[PDB]
Design an enzyme around this catalytic site. Structure first.
Site, mmCIF file in Angstrom:
data_model
loop_
_atom_site.group_PDB
_atom_site.id
_atom_site.type_symbol
_atom_site.label_atom_id
_atom_site.label_comp_id
_atom_site.label_asym_id
_atom_site.label_seq_id
_atom_site.Cartn_x
_atom_site.Cartn_y
_atom_site.Cartn_z
ATOM 1 N N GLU A 182 0.615 -1.116 0.428
ATOM 2 C CA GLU A 182 -0.047 0.186 0.463
ATOM 3 C C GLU A 182 0.951 1.166 -0.050
ATOM 4 O O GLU A 182 1.400 1.345 0.451
ATOM 5 C CB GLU A 182 -0.572 -0.213 1.097
ATOM 6 C CG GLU A 182 -1.568 0.942 0.849
ATOM 7 C CD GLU A 182 -3.214 1.420 2.470
ATOM 8 O OE1 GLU A 182 -2.629 0.282 3.968
ATOM 9 O OE2 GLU A 182 -3.917 1.927 2.453
ATOM 10 N N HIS A 240 0.818 4.682 1.566
ATOM 11 C CA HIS A 240 -0.255 5.796 1.880
ATOM 12 C C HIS A 240 0.654 6.766 2.540
ATOM 13 O O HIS A 240 2.095 7.081 1.787
ATOM 14 C CB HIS A 240 -0.307 4.476 3.512
ATOM 15 C CG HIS A 240 -1.250 5.271 4.280
ATOM 16 N ND1 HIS A 240 -1.211 6.285 5.452
ATOM 17 C CD2 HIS A 240 -2.873 4.891 4.331
ATOM 18 C CE1 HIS A 240 -2.329 6.193 5.985
ATOM 19 N NE2 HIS A 240 -3.854 6.016 5.072
ATOM 20 N N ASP A 246 -3.635 3.849 -1.526
ATOM 21 C CA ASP A 246 -4.579 5.237 -0.014
ATOM 22 C C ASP A 246 -4.814 6.103 -0.683
ATOM 23 O O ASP A 246 -3.329 6.911 -1.099
ATOM 24 C CB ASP A 246 -3.825 4.913 0.404
ATOM 25 C CG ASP A 246 -5.008 5.208 1.579
ATOM 26 O OD1 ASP A 246 -5.428 4.022 2.249
ATOM 27 O OD2 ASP A 246 -5.272 6.761 2.397
ATOM 28 N N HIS A 251 -7.149 1.787 -2.207
ATOM 29 C CA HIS A 251 -8.341 1.959 -1.203
ATOM 30 C C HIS A 251 -8.744 3.669 -1.318
ATOM 31 O O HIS A 251 -8.276 4.464 -1.238
ATOM 32 C CB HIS A 251 -6.928 2.217 0.965
ATOM 33 C CG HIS A 251 -7.435 1.095 0.725
ATOM 34 N ND1 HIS A 251 -6.208 0.367 1.456
ATOM 35 C CD2 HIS A 251 -7.464 0.212 0.007
ATOM 36 C CE1 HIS A 251 -5.951 -0.645 1.573
ATOM 37 N NE2 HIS A 251 -6.640 -1.288 1.156
ATOM 38 N N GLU A 271 -13.287 3.034 2.473
ATOM 39 C CA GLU A 271 -11.916 2.701 3.397
ATOM 40 C C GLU A 271 -12.345 3.974 4.303
ATOM 41 O O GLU A 271 -11.363 4.735 4.445
ATOM 42 C CB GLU A 271 -10.418 2.794 3.563
ATOM 43 C CG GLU A 271 -10.396 2.266 4.510
ATOM 44 C CD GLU A 271 -8.259 1.782 4.876
ATOM 45 O OE1 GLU A 271 -8.265 0.546 4.139
ATOM 46 O OE2 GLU A 271 -7.442 2.056 5.715
#
Lengths: 276, 117, 117, 276, 276, 117, 276, 117
Positions: free
Chosen positions: A148, A150, A180, A211, A247
Site C-alpha cells: 500500500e 499511504h 491509498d 483504497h 476505507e
C-alpha cells in the site's frame, strides 16, 4: 471501468461487537458495493488455519450477497519477534500461507503490508527476497501482491520508485501497487505534500487496487478533503479497471452511537455519482 | 445486531423495482409466535404505507398478515430480525428516509437511513 | 463481548486459592501473534503485581511471558479475549476492586469489578 | 438448605447483544451461583426444535461451569391466536413439548406462566384440564410444573388457594408454586398488600422454586425494598431446600452502560451473607 | 428440451452409510446430471425443522456443484396414525409445511405421494380438499404439486383421468403429474398393461417432471426393459422441457459391493445419447 | 467414503478440457504430512502418465510434487481424500477406464470407472 | 490397581467409515473400558489445529461416556522430509505442539513414537535433545512422554536400558515407558525372545501406560498367545496403577464383516476376570 | 452406522440394574413418524420379552408404545438409530446373547452380541 467496494476495516469498531461477517456482507449488498477487502488477521476464523466448513460458509456468503473478494489484506511480520528478525525463509513461508489462503477464498489481490525500518516507510532490507520467494506461488495461483502507498509517501518519492523499479526488473505481473487516496488529501505531517491526480497516471499500469480513503462525507454526499472527482476521472480516463474500496479511518468510528454504515452509504452515493 | 428496533442493515430496494425492505428486531425479552404479532402502519418520509403492502420474512419464509394471524407454530426468535418487504412500485429514492414503523405483540420506532440506488 | 478492554465476565478467584483471573480483549483492529504482545504491570487496588505473576491463556493454552516472547505462530484473535491468571496466594477479597492493567503490542485500562468468595 | 442461582431474564438487555449463553454461564460461575433459570422462548436455539448438536453444547456448558439447570421458564399460550382460544388438546401438546424439552436439558422445575382472564390474574377456565393432561408426562419425566406467584397476588388470596386446593385434590407431587419475592416488597398497585415472611410458611411444602426478586442493591450489599433477611431465615428455618434465583427487573437494565452482572454480584454477596 | 438429473432414492443403500449429501451432489456433478430429486423425510437434517445453518449449507452445495433442485419428494401421510385418519386441516398443515420447505430449498416441483385406499391406487376420498387447501400457498410460492403415476397404473386408466379432470376443473397451473417410466416397461402384475410412448402425448401439458426409471443398463449403455428411445423422442418432439430424473430401484442396490453410481453413469450416458 | 483407495466419486474430466481428476483416500491408519507422500505413476487403460502431469489437491489447496516434497506443515487426514488432477489435453473418452495408480508414504491400486462427457 | 481401556487404533478399519468418534466412545462405554488412547494424526479434526468448538465437543464426549483420556499417541517425525532431517528445534516445536494439544484434551500420558535409524529400533542420534527440549513444557503441563517398547525389542535389551539410563540421569518424572505386551508373546522374527512377566518388575517405576496387545481371543474369553494371567498378576502385585489399553492389530481387522468391537469385548471380559 | 438393523454399539445393561438397551436403525429408505412405528416382540436367547417392557428413545426423548401411537410430529430419521430400553430386572448376563427383534412400520432381525458386566 473502475468498480467499487468496501474495506471491512471501516467496520473495525463494529466487527465482533454488533456486526458479524454476514452483517458486513449484507451492508455491502445494501450499497451495491460488491468489492470486498478483508484483513486476514481479523475476519478469518481460526486464522491462520480455517476449517473447510468455514471456507464453505465464506463461499456461501459471497454467493448470497454477490460479493467479489478483491483484496486480501495481510502483513509481512518480519518484526513479529522481539529478540530477532525472521529469516527470509520464515517470512516467505508465512507469505505463501497467506497466498494460498487468499486464493482459497477467491481473492485476486493481496495487500501486503511490509515492515518499515526508517520513518520514510522504507521496507526491510530483504523485502525483495521475500517477494521473490513468494512470486512463483502467487503467479501459479493468480494472486497479485501489492504494498500500500499511504501518506506521507509521495507518488514521486523513493518508495514508489523502488517498487516500480522492482516491477520493471523482474518483469512481474503479480506485484503492483495499492494506492491509498490519502496521497491526494488537500484539506487538513512535514514529509507530506499533496499529489495531484495526474501523478497517478504513470503508475496506473502497476496499480491493481485502490483504497478509496475518505475523511469526511457531507450530507450533500460530497467528500470535503480529497479531490475525488478529479482523481476518479483521471483513473477512469486512463484505463483503470480495478476496484475503489471505501476505507473509513476517522476516530469517531469508536464514538458511542456512530453508524459507519451510513457514512459508507454516503461515500458510495458519491462514488456512484462519479463512476456511474 | 443493533440496539434500535429498525436495523440499518438490510434497508434497500427490492428488484423491475417492486418496493423496498427493512429489518426489525423483536423488542421483547422472549420470542413470539407469528400469531402474536400485530403489524402496524409504516410511515416513510411522512407517507403512510398500510399493513397490506408489507410482508414479513421470518426464518427465511415470507408471510402475509393473513398467514401470520393463524400461525402459532412458527417462532420469531429475538436474535433473528424479521425482514419486512414493502410493496412500493419504483422503490425508494436515493438519499435519506425517515422510517417510522409501529407494531405490537400480544401475550412505534423511528429511524433515519440512507438508500443507494 | 464488551466495549471495555478488561471484561467483567471471568473475574474470579482461582482455586486452595492460588490467585485470581480476568479477561482482556485485544484493543486493536487486527489479531496479533503472541510474540507481539508486551504484557505490563497489574495494579489491583493500588497494589502492584508484576509481570512474572501473570500468565496468559489464549486459545485454551496457558503461556508465560517467556513462552509468549518467542511464539510467533499462535494467534490472538480480536474476538477471543485472553484470560490472565494472576498468582496471588489467598486470592482477592470479596467486594469491589479497582483493576488497572497495562499492556502493549508491537508492529493502560481501568475497571471497577466485584469479587464474590 | 436453600441454594442460589440466577434467572437469565436478568440478562434480557444483554443476551444476544453483548452476552452469549456461554457468557451468561461464566457470569453465573463467577458469583458461584449454580442454579440457572432459562426462558424457553429466549435461550434455546431453533426453539421449539433444537438440534442434538445444540443440546450437547448445552450439556457441555452446564458441565464446564458447574451449572445446575433448576427452572425452565415457559408459557401456556392459550391466547396465542387472536381469532380463538386454543383447545385443551393443543395447549396440552405444547405443554408436553415443553416438558420433554425441559427434561432433555436437565431441568427439574418448570415455571409455567398461565394466561389470565381477569386483572386478579385468574388463570383460564381450563387450566386444570391442561395441567392434568400434562401431569402424567411431567411425573414420568420427573418435572415439577409451577405457576409463579407474583405481585399483586397475595399468599393468602384466592389464586394461591386455588392452586393449593388443586394440589391437595389431585395429590400431585409434580405441581407446586414458584414464589416471587415481590409479594414481600415493603418499600415503594391498589390490590397489593405486603405479605409478611411468615405467610410463606403454610406454602413451603408446595414451593419448589423461588424468584429472589430484588429492586435495588446498595453498595453495602443490602436490598433496600424487601425484608430479605427475615424472608430467607423463614425459608431456611422451615426446611426449604429449593433454589433462590436472582431476578432483576429494573428499567435501568436498558440504560446505556448498565452492568447487570455487578448488580447480580451484589445480590449474591447478600445471599451468601444470608445463606452461608 | 428435456433436461436430466438424478433422484437421490437411487442412493438409498448408500446415503448415511458411505455417501453424505455432498458426495451425492458431487456424484451428480460427475455425470453432468444437474437436476436433483430429494426425499424430504430422508435428506433434510432435523426434518421437518431444519436450521438456517443447514439451509445455507444446502445452498452452498447447490452452488458448488451447479445442482438444480427440481423435485421435492414428500408424502401426504393421512394414514400416519393407526387409530384414525388425519383431518383435512392436519393434512393441509403438513402439506403447507412441506411446500414452504420445498420453496425454501429452491425446489419448483413437489412429488406428493398420496395415500391409497384400494389396490387400484385410488387416493383418499378427500385428496381434492387437501390439494385445494394447499394450492393457494403453492401458487404464491411457485411450487407445482405432482402425484406420481407409477405401475401398475395406466396413462389411460381412471387415476390419471381423475387427476386430469381435477386440473381442468380447478384450472390450476400448480398441480400436474409426475410420470414414472415404469408405465412403459415391456420386458419382465395382472393390472399392468404397457403403455405406448404416444400415450404420454395428451398428458404432456400437465407433466411437470418425470422419473426416468430404469431396470437394467447394459455395458453398451442401453436400457433393456423400457423403450427409452421412443419415449424420450416422443417427449422431446412434443415440447416437454421438464426433467428426466434417473431412479434406480433394483434390489441389487443392497448387494455387497454394488456401485449404484456406475449404473447411474451408464444411464446418463444413455440419456446423453438420446437428449444431446 | 469407500473401501477402495481410488474413489469412484470425483472421477471426471477437467474443463477447454485440460485433463481429468480422481480421488484417492489415504490407505493408512494415521494422517501424513505432504512431505511424507511419494506420488507414483498413473496408468489409465495401460497408458502411462508420469508423476509430473499430476497435482494433488489437499485441504482445498493444490500442490505439485516439488511443493509437496518440502511441505511438512500441511496434513493429509485419512478421512479427507486427496484430489489428483492429471494433465491430459482432451481429457478422457466416454465409457470405461481402468485406472491403476501407485503411491507410497514414508515414516498400487486398481479401479474400473466410467467417464461421462 | 491397574485400570483398563482401549486404543482407538483397534478401530482403524472402522473409524471414518462405519464408526465416528462418538461411536468409539460409546463402544468403550459398553465394555466399561474408560481409558482411551487416541492417535493425534487420526482422531483430532483439523489436526494439528483443532478449533475450540471441536475441543468442547471432545470434552462433552468424554463427560457423556465417562471416558478418561489416558494416552495421546503421537510421532516425532524427524524423517518427515526426504531431502534432510529436521533440526532439533523443529522436532522440539512439533513435540511442544503435541504436548499442548495432549494437555488441552485432558491426556496425561503421551506415547511418543521416535524414528529409528537401525533395525534394532535405535532412536535418532538426537532423541535426547528433542526430549530434553520438550521436558520443561511436559513438566509444566503434567504430561508424561513415553516411547513404546514393542517387539522385537527386549525388556533387557539396549533400547530399554538407554531409556532407563536417560530417566535416571535426568531424574525426570515426565519421561517413562509404554510397554506393549507383544514382548510377552509365546505362541506364534529372529531378534525376538519372549520375556517372562517378571522381566517387567525392574521397569515398573518407569512404566506409565501399557498396550494390552492381544492376538487372538477365544470364545472362552481367553487370550491364546500371551501369558495374560501371569503378566497382569505381576503388574498388579508390584504396584502398577496405570492403564492396560486393549490394542488389536490382527489383519482380519480389514476383513469384510469383521466386528472388532466384539473382539475387544472378549478381551475386556478377560481383563475384568483378571483385574476385578 | 452398520449394515445390520440391530447395532452392536450401545448394547449394554442399564443401571441397580433395571434392564438393558440396544440400538436399531430404521430399515427403510425414508424416515417415519413415531405413529407409523409398530414395535414388536423381543427374543433374547429365546426368552420372550413383550412390547410393554420396551421403550423407544428417539431424538434423545423416551417414548412408550402408547405415546408413540399418537405421535405423528416426532420424526425418526434413517441416520439416527433408535435406542430401545428393555425392562429386565438384573439385566443381561455377561457373554453372548442372541437378540431377535421384530418391528414394522405403516405407510424381524437377528444379532449375536456380547454383554460385559
Amino acid at each position: 471501468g473502475p468498480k467499487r467496494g468496501v474495506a471491512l476495516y471501516s467496520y473495525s469498531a463494529e466487527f465482533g461487537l454488533t456486526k458479524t461477517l454476514e452483517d458486513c456482507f449484507e451492508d455491502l449488498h445494501d450499497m451495491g458495493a460488491h468489492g470486498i477487502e478483508i484483513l486476514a488477521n481479523t475476519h478469518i476464523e481460526n486464522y491462520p488455519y480455517p476449517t473447510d466448513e468455514w471456507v464453505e460458509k465464506w463461499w456461501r456468503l459471497c454467493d448470497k450477497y454477490e460479493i467479489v473478494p478483491v483484496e486480501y489484506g495481510n502483513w509481512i511480520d518480519s518484526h513479529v519477534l522481539g529478540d530477532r528478525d525472521l529469516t527470509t525463509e520464515e517470512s516467505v513461508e508465512m507469505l505463501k500461507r497467506d497466498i494460498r489462503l487468499a486464493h482459497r477464498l477467491g481473492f485476486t489481490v493481496m495487500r501486503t503490508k511490509m515492515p518499515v525500518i526508517n520513518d520514510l516507510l522504507e521496507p526491510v532490507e530483504n523485502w525483495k527476497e521475500i517477494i521473490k520467494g513468494a512470486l512463483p506461488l502467487a503467479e501459479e495461483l493468480g494472486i497479485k501482491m501489492c504494498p500500500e502507498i499511504h501518506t506521507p509517501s509521495n507518488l514521486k518519492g523513493k518508495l514508489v520508485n523502488d517498487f516500480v523499479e522492482f516491477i520493471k526488473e523482474t518483469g512481474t505481473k503479480n506485484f503492483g501497487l495499492n494506492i491509498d487516496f490519502s496521497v491526494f488529501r488537500t484539506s487538513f505531517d512535514p514529509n507530506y505534500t499533496p499529489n495531484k491526480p495526474e501523478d497517478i497516471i504513470p503508475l496506473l499500469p502497476y496499480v491493481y487496487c485502490c483504497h478509496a480513503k475518505f475523511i469526511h462525507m457531507s450530507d450533500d454526499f460530497k467528500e470535503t478533503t480529497i479531490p475525488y472527482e478529479e482523481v476518479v476521472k483521471t483513473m477512469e480516463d486512463n484505463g483503470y479497471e480495478g476496484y475503489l474500496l471505501s476505507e473509513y479511518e476517522g476516530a469517531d468510528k469508536y464514538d458511542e452511537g456512530y453508524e459507519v454504515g451510513q457514512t459508507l452509504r454516503k461515500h458510495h452515493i458519491l462514488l456512484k455519482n462519479l463512476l456511474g | 445486531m443493533e440496539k434500535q428496533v429498525i436495523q440499518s442493515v438490510g434497508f434497500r430496494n427490492i428488484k423491475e423495482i417492486t418496493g423496498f425492505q427493512f429489518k426489525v428486531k423483536l423488542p421483547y425479552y422472549r420470542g413470539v409466535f407469528l400469531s402474536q404479532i400485530r403489524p402496524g402502519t409504516l410511515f416513510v418520509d411522512g407517507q403512510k404505507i398500510e399493513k397490506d403492502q408489507i410482508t414479513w420474512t421470518i426464518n427465511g419464509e415470507e408471510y402475509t398478515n393473513q398467514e401470520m394471524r393463524g400461525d402459532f407454530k412458527t417462532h420469531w426468535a429475538t436474535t433473528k430480525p424479521a425482514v419486512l418487504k414493502v410493496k412500493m412500485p419504483g422503490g425508494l429514492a436515493q438519499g435519506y428516509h425517515d422510517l417510522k414503523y409501529g407494531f405490537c405483540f400480544t401475550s412505534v420506532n423511528e429511524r433515519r437511513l440512507l438508500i443507494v440506488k
